[PDB]
Every structure is written in C-alpha cells, then in structure tokens.
Amino acid sequence: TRTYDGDGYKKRAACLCFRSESEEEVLLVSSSRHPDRWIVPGGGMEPEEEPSVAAVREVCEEAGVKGTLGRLVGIFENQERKHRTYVYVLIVTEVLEDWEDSVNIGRKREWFKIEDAIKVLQYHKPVQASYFET
C-alpha cells in the first residue's frame, strides 16, 4: 500500500549503504525499468511504518544487505515525481546472495566510491546525487 504526506507527496525511505564506517564506498542498485541505470536503494513507506523501519526493509528487498542503521541525513523532495524521501546512513555488515529483487526482477548491485556514485546519479537522479553533498 502506497502512503502520502498531507500535500500528496508519496512517502519514501532510502539508505546510503556504506561498505564501512569510513563511508568511502556506497552500494547502488539497478533501476527495474532501465537496468543500465544506477539508483540509491529505497521505496515506499507502508501505513504506520516508521521511516527508519521502511529504510531497512527497502534496502533488504532491493539490495540484499543488512547492517547498523545510523543517522537520518535529511528529508529530500523530488518535485517532478512528487516524492518525499527520508534518507538514512546504513553501515553494511551482511551481504546476502539471493535477495528478493535479484530472484524476482534480476536487480543488480555494485559498490561505488562516493565521487563515482555522485557522477552516475547526476543525470537521471540529481536529488539522489544531493543525498551525498552533506
């Protein structure tokens, strides 16, 4: 079930999934619509679902990783898509081999140095590139 803020923006949560506490490499996943495009893993919050809980669930489903949830980075709007996304830091401690989106739609995942993640997100996902600019 999709959920919405009072202004009609779709509620979403996403994680910056870092390889380590150094926050030097981050996990991106492929788009299902365009498998040659990279995005930050995230998606819709369920009814009454805490944003931090949604963030952890979405990363598990989309990226097949678990770890230690850190700070809320911020709340980011995509005016074009009418999205409002809570973005968290996650330090990855478990990498699972056969996760929900791999099995179901063949979603890919890849480690990126921060500067290269910002580069690949800039064209289609400038708001996701801004997640890192803190």
Ligand SMILES: O=P(O)(O)CP(=O)(O)O[C@@H]1[C@@H](OP(=O)(O)O)[C@H](OP(=O)(O)CP(=O)(O)O)[C@H](OP(=O)(O)O)[C@H](OP(=O)(O)O)[C@H]1OP(=O)(O)O
């Ligand atoms: O596909 P996933 O959820 O993994 C990633 P994302 O949501 O970013 O994919 C969107 C897609 O949305 P969705 O597939 O319906 O959720 C868009 O679709 P919608 O927002 O539903 C617009 P639609 O109703 O499909 O015309 C539109 O895909 P499309 O329209 O080209 O199929 C975007 O592509 P673009 O056309 O903006 O370059 C594409 O963005 P991408 O991440 O591929 O750059």
